[PDB]
Amino acid sequence: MRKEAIHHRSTDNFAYAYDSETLHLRLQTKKNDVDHVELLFGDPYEWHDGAWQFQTMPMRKTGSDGLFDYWLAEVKPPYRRLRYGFVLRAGGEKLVYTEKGFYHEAPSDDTAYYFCFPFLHRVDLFQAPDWVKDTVWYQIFPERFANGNPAISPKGARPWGSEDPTPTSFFGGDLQGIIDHLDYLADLGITGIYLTPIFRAPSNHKYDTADYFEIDPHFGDKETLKTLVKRCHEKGIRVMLDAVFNHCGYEFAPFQDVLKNGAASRYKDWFHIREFPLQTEPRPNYDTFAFVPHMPKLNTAHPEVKRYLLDVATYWIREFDIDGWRLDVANEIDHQFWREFRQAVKALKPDVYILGLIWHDAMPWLRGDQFDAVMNYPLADAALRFFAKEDMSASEFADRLMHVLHSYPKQVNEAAFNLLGSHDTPRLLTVCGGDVRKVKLLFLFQLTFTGSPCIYYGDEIGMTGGNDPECRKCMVWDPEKQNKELYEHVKQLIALRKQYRALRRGDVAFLTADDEVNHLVYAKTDGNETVMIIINRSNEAAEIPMPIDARGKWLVNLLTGERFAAEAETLCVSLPPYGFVLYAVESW
Amino acid sequence: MRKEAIHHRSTDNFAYAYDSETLHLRLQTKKNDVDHVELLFGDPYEWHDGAWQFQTMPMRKTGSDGLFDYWLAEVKPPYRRLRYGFVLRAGGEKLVYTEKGFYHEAPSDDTAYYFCFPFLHRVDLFQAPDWVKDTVWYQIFPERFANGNPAISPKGARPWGSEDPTPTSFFGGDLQGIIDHLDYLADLGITGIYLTPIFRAPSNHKYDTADYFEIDPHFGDKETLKTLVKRCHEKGIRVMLDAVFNHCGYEFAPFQDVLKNGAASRYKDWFHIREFPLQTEPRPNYDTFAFVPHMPKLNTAHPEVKRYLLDVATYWIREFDIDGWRLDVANEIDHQFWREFRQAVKALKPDVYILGLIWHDAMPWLRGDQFDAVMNYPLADAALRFFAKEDMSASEFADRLMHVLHSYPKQVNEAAFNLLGSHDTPRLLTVCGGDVRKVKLLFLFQLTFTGSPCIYYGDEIGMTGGNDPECRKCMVWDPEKQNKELYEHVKQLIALRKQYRALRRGDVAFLTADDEVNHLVYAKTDGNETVMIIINRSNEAAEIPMPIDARGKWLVNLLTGERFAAEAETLCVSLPPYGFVLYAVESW
Ligand SMILES: OC[C@H]1O[C@@H]2O[C@H]3[C@H](O)[C@@H](O)[C@@H](O[C@H]4[C@H](O)[C@@H](O)[C@@H](O[C@H]5[C@H](O)[C@@H](O)[C@@H](O[C@H]6[C@H](O)[C@@H](O)[C@@H](O[C@H]7[C@H](O)[C@@H](O)[C@@H](O[C@H]8[C@H](O)[C@@H](O)[C@@H](O[C@H]1[C@H](O)[C@H]2O)O[C@@H]8CO)O[C@@H]7CO)O[C@@H]6CO)O[C@@H]5CO)O[C@@H]4CO)O[C@@H]3CO
């Protein structure tokens, strides 16, 4: 029984509080290295006969990547506090893993041997807005969406052409447009929209922001905005704006003032500047986004900058009653700042969803003191890799997913922002090579996977385009020109997720086979509710055997409707090329 | 090459900023499973040819416990950002470890694959006061040290037998006393006293706290303290106090109130009470320390308490200028409180040492937003295990030591509070079975290890006594009944640590052999200063071999002065049973 692979710490994804009463303890072991494993536990002060009184329940296997197996244990400390150790019987061997080491028998003279989860506090608890767990997001890069009132800038008219429209010049979008095609959304079934930056700024993309307190005229005015939110909410649609706090635009008052005066400027400390005769020759002598001079890094550490932002952050939550902030390049800001940020925001509107943009691992932020969630990129990479480019197998895929899933605490996932693409990556279609078939499978997986899914304005009606700035083509409002089949597909799937909690709140369970390198089958569960998903990611007709739960009564096809009685041990499911099917199991 | 054992995550002890411009990256791998390992790094936005421009430097093995070896990479990231990966070689096998997985060749099409340490913000940087690293702590339990002005309570005056007195009832210790024996301390060499709780409370010990704003009379008064404090500083001695916040006393005003009113009392929320007919029958129906009725837990979540306690914390820092708070049962309070706590305090007096009392793994609190350090109880467990009880071998010791050490970020250990005993643990001497020899070995080890050591009043003159309240015998001031040899021993060892930088803030390195069970040989290094310690943990004269570095010119005995030319491969050192020797290796 290899020990180099047995691991647990009482922190982050291994030990945490799920709710204000239940603790979650995850243990890591090698793949099939250990048969069973029990959670040995008890309240830290429950002593008797000079020996620590303790009881022991058993942990279940909740999945495994390509190396480890993961064990979960759900427990409620009688007296809000607990000490704990692990007991793993693998074959004839029997170990007891403790913070102090491995012992052939459970020490009982002292608690010191065991890991400890002090007090389960409700305040330290991690709780993200319960609603995002049920919404379906739709991102709409304002500029290229719909032209309502022509309070637009002077240049190019809708659809430059069939291919390649878009260099780095405007088409004239605007908030009004969104308000107008607001019926479209409500029909597609979405419940939340996320607008990319919209504050007074020089580009078609509002990231090189100029004034955070003013909405870009080319988009609208306070009136226009509060109306968009009114209509939205009115229909049950939430709104999340884009918070660009890591850096500011070149036209930002204070930064401009820094050149007007140099070392003199009353705003030097608002940025990070080394050399003062600001020269951008080889490259900026001050910290800028990547190396983009026209985008200097703010100084979230400075006292003022902090209050400038903090006010902004709250300004819109109070002035327009928005529903959340997409924090841009969030990972490049001091956690302290985010701590104050969350406090300011959450003190005004608890329900404000605080989504951050972090590409890599985000444990450091999702401790419950900073972000509500983060863009689940590691997931996207996988989905595309599997369905689009067909690089990894179904198991490799299943593995990569199990792995990420287990690197955060349970609830951290339930609020994750799962997207497949955005305004920075190649349109979902083109990445599939125009094989809509694939695109539908991507939507399926994503719309039938717990988290908080988001759709990029063009993808549902089959919009094609390469990388930036191609993914940003003007939304197609020509009935004839948009793929209604893809649209109906997403529509029904969205409404499907809408009435099958399992699909949006349950846990995944891959019944993977290291043999069916192209057959992927997983099931979502929530109490009684169980939905089975089968996918033949093959270019040939396949026959995939599906495990029918013994306890099943009925078996319904969420697509076809046909509802037949389950009966055999298994159900060989026949599917066409790149085909799929959703089955809802029963109980009686 | 076992992958189940390799591990790293960008966070905690694995990836942290050491200082303003330095990052430490640790890699975990199986013991001896890997020959070499190179840190593959580079800036996130550094590009050319569409290929990410990254470079490589090699990591050094910083030691290993029982199951893993450990690697450290000290990198100075320019522009402060970094995306990085590891490259571990072996018997021809060459693997590339990235957050995204294992590859036989470092990917270069996109940084997404690599681990990431975003920005190296200064404000999030962990910085515990600096002096604590350069001090040795003497801890005194007020009620049993020295008796000055007898404003003492009415009870037994001084001892009876050599170990008889002490049941759970007074003797007359008081602050004046501490003052009247400074010379003793000043002479011993200690430079910081940490004294048990001294606030109005009806108990020989003062955790039963009844008023956090008044010095229990029996010890003295406001004026007395200002003196102790005024004088200590004068002598170069710092003062730390015991903050008892996890719970209050039974005679605590606010709790008293709640006793006669219950559902009424303005203070109903100040604590934790389920059923309101407040009863201490089979056991409290309200949250209390362990199950100690007269010690109810506080609500550090409640707005008033928080303001109350935060003021207490600040009070004794303004009015008496103390240098450090000892936070008792700290692990049972919600981190948020410890964050506000740290701010209030540090804001008033940066040098305030905020030491928490956490037994188990204290990572969650050592992120830099809460405690400055914690009681190194894991290392105390090892020491005793090895020297006194003599269970584990020199290897098992050297391992546990490497394990606890590698589980925190370097600068966290530097400020760790290294104690060997308290008023809760049995006296070394008795734990050594009365073998003063072992004892001196403990002191030797303790005063040779990096951290901030703390001697327990009495242990220097070799007092005796087992568990509570044995370890609380009145202090022996009779020159006749106090081991002058031990005192004089600890004294020159302290004076040694004070003059050999390596001994106090350097790195440890065990050269112990696996077949060795009684010979402990280790070196403390810091720059060109190198101190070698040889310990014969055997009741029998021994000959231990000690390697000498090539460059070594001299080799000086620290407690003999004897100095001799290096010139040799090894130096067989002969020691008497339970012997020890400190060598300073001068080298041109
Ligand atoms: O304010 C409370 C307390 O806080 C501090 O104590 C901390 C200490 O600094 C840490 O080192 C640590 O201790 C852990 C301990 O070392 C472990 O061994 C384990 O302890 C278990 C015991 O081994 C086990 O035997 C049993 O304990 C039973 C006792 O044996 C039994 O006698 C009785 O307990 C009575 C005490 O013995 C008695 O002294 C008295 O306690 C009061 C103290 O005398 C007084 O100084 C003060 O305590 C401080 C302490 O000084 C700080 O250093 O308040 C005490 C409260 O009255 O009365 C007790 C009456 O019940 O019953 C116990 C079973 O309940 O069980 C323990 C289980 O914990 O784990 C320890 C936890 O880490 O942590 C402590 C804070 O917990």
Ligand SMILES: OC[C@H]1O[C@@H]2O[C@H]3[C@H](O)[C@@H](O)[C@@H](O[C@H]4[C@H](O)[C@@H](O)[C@@H](O[C@H]5[C@H](O)[C@@H](O)[C@@H](O[C@H]6[C@H](O)[C@@H](O)[C@@H](O[C@H]7[C@H](O)[C@@H](O)[C@@H](O[C@H]8[C@H](O)[C@@H](O)[C@@H](O[C@H]1[C@H](O)[C@H]2O)O[C@@H]8CO)O[C@@H]7CO)O[C@@H]6CO)O[C@@H]5CO)O[C@@H]4CO)O[C@@H]3CO
């Ligand atoms: O003004 C600059 C920029 O502003 C806007 O950009 C913002 C963007 O819209 C936001 O979404 C966010 O960006 C975050 C993004 O959401 C995350 O997904 C992520 O990005 C990672 C990349 O996805 C990943 O591929 C890798 O990227 C590396 C590339 O692979 C590598 O080829 C190279 O990049 C070069 C580009 O390929 C090249 O085209 C060129 O890029 C320029 C754009 O074409 C140009 O339009 C403009 O960008 C605007 C953008 O359009 C606005 O919407 O300037 C770009 C720079 O010249 O040059 C690149 C070399 O610099 O290098 C990258 C890595 O350096 O890793 C990344 C990081 O994980 O994180 C994004 C935040 O980092 O914020 C931006 C900025 O506000």
